[PDB]
Amino acid sequence: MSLWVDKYRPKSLNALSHNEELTNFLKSLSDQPRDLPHLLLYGPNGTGKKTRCMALLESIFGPGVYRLKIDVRQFVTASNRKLELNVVSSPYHLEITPSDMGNNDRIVIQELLKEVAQMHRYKCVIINEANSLTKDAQAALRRTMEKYSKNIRLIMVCDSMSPIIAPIKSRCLLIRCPAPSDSEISTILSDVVTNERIQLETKDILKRIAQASNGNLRVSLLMLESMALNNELALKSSSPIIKPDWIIVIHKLTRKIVKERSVNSLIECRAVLYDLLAHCIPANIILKELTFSLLDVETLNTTNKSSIIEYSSVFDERLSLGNKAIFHLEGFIAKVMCCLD
Amino acid sequence: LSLQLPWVEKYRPQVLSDIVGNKETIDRLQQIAKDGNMPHMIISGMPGIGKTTSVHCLAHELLGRSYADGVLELNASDDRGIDVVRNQIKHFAQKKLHLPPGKHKIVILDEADSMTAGAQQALRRTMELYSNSTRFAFACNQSNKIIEPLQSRCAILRYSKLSDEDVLKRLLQIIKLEDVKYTNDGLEAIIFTAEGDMRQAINNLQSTVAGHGLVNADNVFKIVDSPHPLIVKKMLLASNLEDSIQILRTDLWKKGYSSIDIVTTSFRVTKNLAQVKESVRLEMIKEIGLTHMRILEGVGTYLQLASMLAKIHKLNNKA
Amino acid sequence: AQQPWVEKYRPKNLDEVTAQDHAVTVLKKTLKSANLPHMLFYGPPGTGKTSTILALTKELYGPDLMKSRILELNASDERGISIVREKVKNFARLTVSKPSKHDLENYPCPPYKIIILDEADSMTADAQSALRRTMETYSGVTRFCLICNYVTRIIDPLASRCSKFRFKALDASNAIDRLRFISEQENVKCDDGVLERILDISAGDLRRGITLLQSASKGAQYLGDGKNITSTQVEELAGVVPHDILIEIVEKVKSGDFDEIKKYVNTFMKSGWSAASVVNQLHEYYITNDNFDTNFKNQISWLLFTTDSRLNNGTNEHIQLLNLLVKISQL
Amino acid sequence: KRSKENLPWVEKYRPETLDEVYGQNEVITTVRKFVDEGKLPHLLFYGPPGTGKTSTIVALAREIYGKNYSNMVLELNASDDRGIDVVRNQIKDFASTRQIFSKGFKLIILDEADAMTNAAQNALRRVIERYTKNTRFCVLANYAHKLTPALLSRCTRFRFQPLPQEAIERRIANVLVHEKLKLSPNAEKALIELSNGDMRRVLNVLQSCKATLDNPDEDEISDDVIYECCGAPRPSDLKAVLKSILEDDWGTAHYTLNKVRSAKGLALIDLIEGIVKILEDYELQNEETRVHLLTKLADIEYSISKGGNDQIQGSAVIGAIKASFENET
Amino acid sequence: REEDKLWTVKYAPTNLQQVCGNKGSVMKLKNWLANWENSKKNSFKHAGKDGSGVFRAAMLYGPPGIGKTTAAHLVAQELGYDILEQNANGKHFVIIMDEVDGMGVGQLAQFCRKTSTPLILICNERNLPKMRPFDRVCLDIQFRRPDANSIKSRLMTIAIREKFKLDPNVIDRLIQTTRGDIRQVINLLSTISTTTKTINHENINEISKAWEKNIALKPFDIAHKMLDGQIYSDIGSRNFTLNDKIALYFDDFDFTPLMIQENYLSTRPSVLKPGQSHLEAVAEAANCISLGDIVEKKIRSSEQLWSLLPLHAVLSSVYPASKVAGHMAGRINFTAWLGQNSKSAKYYRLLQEIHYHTRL
DNA sequence: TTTATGTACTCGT
DNA sequence: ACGAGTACATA
DNA sequence: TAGTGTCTGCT
DNA sequence: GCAGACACTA
Ligand SMILES: Nc1ncnc2c1ncn2[C@@H]1O[C@H](COP(=O)(O)OP(=O)(O)OP(O)(O)=S)[C@@H](O)[C@H]1O
Ligand SMILES: Nc1ncnc2c1ncn2[C@@H]1O[C@H](COP(=O)(O)OP(=O)(O)OP(O)(O)=S)[C@@H](O)[C@H]1O
Ligand SMILES: Nc1ncnc2c1ncn2[C@@H]1O[C@H](COP(=O)(O)OP(=O)(O)OP(O)(O)=S)[C@@H](O)[C@H]1O
Ligand SMILES: Nc1ncnc2c1ncn2[C@@H]1O[C@H](COP(=O)(O)OP(=O)(O)OP(O)(O)=S)[C@@H](O)[C@H]1O
Ligand SMILES: Nc1ncnc2c1ncn2[C@@H]1O[C@H](COP(=O)(O)OP(=O)(O)O)[C@@H](O)[C@H]1O
Ligand SMILES: [Mg+2]
Ligand SMILES: [Mg+2]
Ligand SMILES: [Mg+2]
Ligand SMILES: [Mg+2]
């Protein structure tokens, strides 16, 4: 693929240079694939958890695992709300992600598991974004992977278990994929720019990219591609870091909040929130980085920052227990302006 | 064995004069029975106040001894639908029966509040077509579900709660006709336990007389308890927290009242509460509904109710 | 073997159920008799409720009879009010299958069938209300069993109609024998208290402890040096934070500077350690220590409880732990 | 199936005569004088779960009627469908037609009637009113808020009080006589505070205790057997935990609570209700202390119902109690 | 038959002089019907002064019992037409079908588009979603609550013919009590005159208290009523109680809480506490909207706890507007979340459309 | 949008 | 008569 | 052609 | 509340 993030992706444990202790543990588990428990890989985003799951599969299932395909099935729920979530099929392993509307994920998971329960011989299943499960598909898994413990193996790819209920953690193995420090991120970026052709004026550009990414390999590779295209394959230390329009408008919103604590300012903040939620960005990370932006302003005091993080936690639990994403964000911003004024 | 007929139909009124309550509606019905040209009416309100027996007595006075020939008793008990009810209304209205020169065929639709919009809009057409031959009648628990044009093309005679005088008069009539010993304490106990309802009052009186015999307040209390809204209102308006907690436990936890019913009654009482500032009522309702949710996931612990009352007193104390 | 340890050492018989004996003795003496009541198995996950009920099913009727005398329903299939009103009602309405001469000769074979609803707390209130008289109407021909790790979700009538058997959590003291037996049977080496530390890490769940022991064993045969398993390996495999990082976390907290605290919080979150473990470790450090004042201990206990309760309801671990550190820094 | 003794104590014993029902003495004598004299109205039986509603109505049907009442009395429950179609077909045909077995009136049992729809109740109230001459309706409901007020007003309301100590004592004496079993006074007291006014709970615990003993005969069940079989914390244990929380430091109390939980596998939640129950009779000079105690304990049990780490929740209980009592002065 | 007939049909308007109120719409319909043949000879190329020539069919709406059907019949019969009803110039058949909203709507709209005969539609709601096909295919003749003079004179005539005393200054209360429903006024006069032949100002207050023609408010009317500082004051709360506020919510309970959240920011509060700024009042008000977010999540979930609907009123509609209540600076704004949800859902659909296309 | 349970309705066989 | 597809209310 | 006064649609 | 339209008089 022309994209830079996915060309340079390891295809086995020996090709994995992200970490060594976790590679040792993965090949320790792969040494005896017979007694393999249900896995749960967790960590910050961009650590290659999907890649580690893949490389473990080829360590266990051998070659040919990356020969995936796309299959279409039909799903029936209450009334006649037809669902056609796609399963990413392949020989041996079958891959599917519960990226439904978040209301009827039970039927898809149950149907796929009961269909693959017909028959080395045990079929592993990985589902992504398992944190945002609706607490009911987890209830289905709680029995499905308990009874089908000799034919189906289930692997969790999620960034946290805080939404995950206790039984799922109980009947699964908790292994952690950490994010690397700046130095080995700079090393892997140097390896990449050695593989293809970029002339570097100074080696500090990769360190600055690693600092900007804050522990994310996919973000680092996308940033490297962006700088390579913008600078015509000639990296320069004077070139500033490229930030998303999302973070840019959040920064402008924070500056607007701190410069004017008025109701009208809250109106344009609500308009920006409308547009950003229309850009299909989950509101939890929006609130998280918004609060981190409020805590990264020099003129803020310590009591104001403490109140900001308190309201952050409160509206975070409110956002977790709710569906209207705009309500909690608007309330938190109103409380922030109230605290500042 | 075969029982005697219950006190419901043993004393259901047969003529319009027997019905007690609001004098204006009853004597209007009597005057229009004397006249004969009865207009279409929608009757609504709280149930058991004479919303159907008054219509039956009016129909009896209108149609004399030919009642069975030209009265179509309809209700939700038999069958309801659009193209069943409209078919039966069309069949009944198209019956050329020799009525008296100043009389019509009265049609009674008891409990038509739950009727569909299509059935009501077809009933409008049947009215505007056969108004010169038949005149309808609606008795419903809530007129809000009825479409607005139906109430537009009707003589609305909504009733209200029967006062203690009407209930006392009717109960004294039943007592004198059934040879029941009574006491003023028993009478007022029946009045409070009636909640302004005839059927509940006669049921409590019948239970008391066929049980303890003497109609006193204590025997009525043994056979039936005080309504929960009053006790819950006393709960949510008490001064101290320990008094509220002991009232809660002794009156609604040692008496077997379900916790979800307690919280629902608290919500209704606070929503229909007076003499309290509006914002105070709103915040009390907010926290009572939080406790309601807490009961709803499955946590029906008595301590949830205790915490609800504790937060009620915390908000009442104004920090 | 060919399949994991958790389903390999499941109690086949009633006597194999360790820790829980107050209900196992009841079931054992009900095996001889036939007056089996309705069972409500409630307790923490991994306490062996499913294993106990499967053992009871095997001992009551034997492998042949349970196929046609046991009905299994769970969240893997539909649990709506229609399914409750039709399938369960029909199954309880039919007569019992005739026991064979072989089954009656070997097994006691009580003349009733058992319908077990594992994860019964997930049923709707309407379904639970509908499934009330199916027990009493057909009690002479069948019995019901309910398994649910939240007993509070079960409504009052449904909980009353069944007998409550509380499956206590398998702590270090009660479940040491089972883990030890697994250790000598699988030839897993324990140095001084590795099994005890593993039981301490698990929140009363033997399945989690067996999983950590299996992972430690996997590492042991992968190294292949035949060396004694240390507590460091099993604590690193569990995912708990090393004590020195906890000490420097406390040092940063005692400083009170917000900027350094936030920077170190970001440094800690890019490591990826779970915030629940951090809350637990801060708890066992601050509560056990004596230098902190009583009011400070009460405040930090309340704050840790609030943080853990919020972490149970999803949310973001970064915000929760950063706010927790800020709160405990300003006490 | 295979003799009546092959049944649980809840179901082996079930009253078939009105004299075998204790506790609700007022209700039972009132309905007895309803049915013997011949003035039984439409009934509404309201009470807690497991307080003898359906047993009472079945015994009433057996007393009034003959043994063969299959076509005489129709029992309707949430186990089968109870939509408005059921009311308009089965109830309609049953109440409309005069009795075929005899020439008397009819009785229809609306068991757990609080689970039917509003339209079902709207049709059912008129079903009751039109055909009340030859048909009576008895309403069994645990929640009165799911019933329309018209259905409340039609039938006379019978409030089933929770069964007091006397009813439980006589019933356990009867089942001990029937099953040839002996009980210690502390064991039956523990049954009194554990049953929560339910025959089902006390009978199930008694059956579990009978199956607990190695020899059912010649052995007496004690309160320790009650506590170990039901997993109920001992009152002395609960008061010791509360005293350690209220008088010791944060290390001693935490160690004591962990040791108590680990020794007998006690549940933290049941410990919470034990402390709460021993806390109402504790005099508090500060009213806000009660507020903080109630709200903090309520949040802790809410978290327990949602689940989580047990030691953190136990220390949360300790901290809530200590901080609230710190308000004392 | 005689002397046994309802007042609403025995005292029926015989000509357009007898009909009272909404007279401009009466001339509009009369000129439409008189010039319908002129439009037919013109092949519907262009309209006239009133802009009704191009319209193939006319259509009426308004409150019930205002005289839409009566005026249509009288216009048809005075000009000379054959009245015919297909609802569920003298020799020219005119179609007078009532209750278009009582439903097929697409086929009826097409039949209105192509009709070789005069056609009149009578309904009560135009802005209904089912009436969207009738947006640009029928004339917009609009009736309303009529003036209290011609109906007053008609009631004088009816009363002096029926021999019962009344006062001149009763028409205003009669019209406003019945929301301008003339038929209900006739029914009220008949009903009262059956017993009380002295319907005057001394009794009209109990008459109104017994005969309020209560009607559900549209969302916009709900928002304006909910966002009023008078009804949350001590004096104004007694007239419009909390129960009425809860009852006001249930009229459009799907759309009520979205409207309150959209415009609780654009209103200047009038019940501000000492020290309560407009920004601080919003912060508490927005907190309750997030508090009401949990209730809406639980009600419309797998549990389906619809007994909690009154709770969603207080947390999401009443209390958020109870602290910022006052005169509004601008206009009622319709909620933009519904438009945002549709735009985001397609963007969410586009998010997973190409992503699965390029997955392999 | 929501999301099962229930009721309703008419079309079709 | 009964079953299936569609829509509405759920205070 | 332009002031009052009131009813109505903002989806 | 913000216009927009429909009268009455002028
Ligand atoms: N005003 C009254 N005077 C005498 N008996 C009355 C009166 N109102 C009701 N009853 C008695 O109530 C019973 C009939 O109740 P109904 O009038 O049919 O109830 P309802 O008022 O129509 O309410 P709903 O909505 O139909 S349940 C008979 O036993 C009557 O004797
Ligand atoms: N008392 C016990 N003795 C022996 N093994 C046990 C015991 N309790 C639990 N286990 C082990 O725990 C593992 C899982 O047991 P389960 O029966 O699934 O517990 P559980 O109560 O069903 O957990 P759930 O279903 O998630 S609530 C198996 O490997 C069992 O062998
Ligand atoms: N006074 C009593 N005397 C003897 N047994 C009783 C008494 N009250 C209740 N029981 C027993 O309680 C058991 C269960 O109660 P039931 O009457 O069957 O059900 P219920 O009390 O009506 O409550 P629900 O609706 O079934 S949850 C019965 O088997 C009876 O044996
Ligand atoms: N302007 C009026 N002047 C005199 N009487 C009227 C007037 N408007 C209505 N009425 C009376 O009220 C009755 C209502 O008749 P309709 O015109 O059918 O009512 P409507 O306005 O069409 O409302 P719908 O279609 O029935 S909901 C008439 O038959 C008259 O008796
Ligand atoms: N050791 C490594 N060498 C090269 N690329 C890596 C390595 N680890 C991760 N990556 C990159 O990470 C990308 C995938 O990351 P992903 O699995 O999405 O992380 P997460 O699962 O945390 O979101 C791949 O495109 C791959 O190029
Ligand atoms: Mg009635
Ligand atoms: Mg299980
Ligand atoms: Mg019962
Ligand atoms: Mg009309």
CSV table of N, CA and C and ligand atoms in Angstrom, one decimal, chain C residues 132-133 136 161, chain D residues 50 52-55 111-112 140 142 200, ligand 8:
chain,number,residue,atom,x,y,z
C,132,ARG,N,-42.5,-16.6,37.3
C,132,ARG,CA,-42.7,-16.7,38.8
C,132,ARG,C,-43.6,-18.0,39.1
C,133,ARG,N,-44.7,-18.1,38.5
C,133,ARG,CA,-45.6,-19.3,38.8
C,133,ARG,C,-45.2,-20.6,38.1
C,136,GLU,N,-43.9,-22.9,41.0
C,136,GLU,CA,-44.8,-23.5,41.9
C,136,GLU,C,-45.8,-24.4,41.2
C,161,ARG,N,-38.4,-17.1,45.7
C,161,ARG,CA,-38.8,-18.4,45.2
C,161,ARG,C,-37.6,-19.4,45.2
D,50,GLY,N,-44.3,-13.7,48.4
D,50,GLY,CA,-44.2,-14.9,49.3
D,50,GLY,C,-44.9,-14.7,50.6
D,52,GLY,N,-48.4,-15.6,50.9
D,52,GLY,CA,-49.6,-16.4,50.9
D,52,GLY,C,-50.8,-15.7,50.2
D,53,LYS,N,-50.7,-15.4,49.0
D,53,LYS,CA,-51.8,-14.8,48.2
D,53,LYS,C,-52.4,-16.0,47.4
D,54,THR,N,-51.7,-16.6,46.5
D,54,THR,CA,-52.2,-17.7,45.7
D,54,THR,C,-52.6,-18.9,46.5
D,55,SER,N,-51.8,-19.2,47.5
D,55,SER,CA,-52.2,-20.3,48.4
D,55,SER,C,-53.6,-20.0,49.1
D,111,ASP,N,-53.6,-13.7,38.8
D,111,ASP,CA,-52.4,-13.9,39.5
D,111,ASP,C,-51.3,-13.0,38.9
D,112,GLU,N,-50.5,-12.4,39.8
D,112,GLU,CA,-49.5,-11.3,39.5
D,112,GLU,C,-50.1,-10.4,38.4
D,140,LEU,N,-54.3,-10.5,42.3
D,140,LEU,CA,-53.1,-10.7,43.1
D,140,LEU,C,-52.0,-9.7,42.5
D,142,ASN,N,-48.2,-7.5,43.6
D,142,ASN,CA,-47.2,-7.1,44.5
D,142,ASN,C,-46.9,-5.6,44.4
D,200,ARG,N,-41.1,-18.5,52.1
D,200,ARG,CA,-40.1,-19.2,51.2
D,200,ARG,C,-38.7,-19.2,51.7
J,8,MG,MG,-48.4,-15.7,44.3
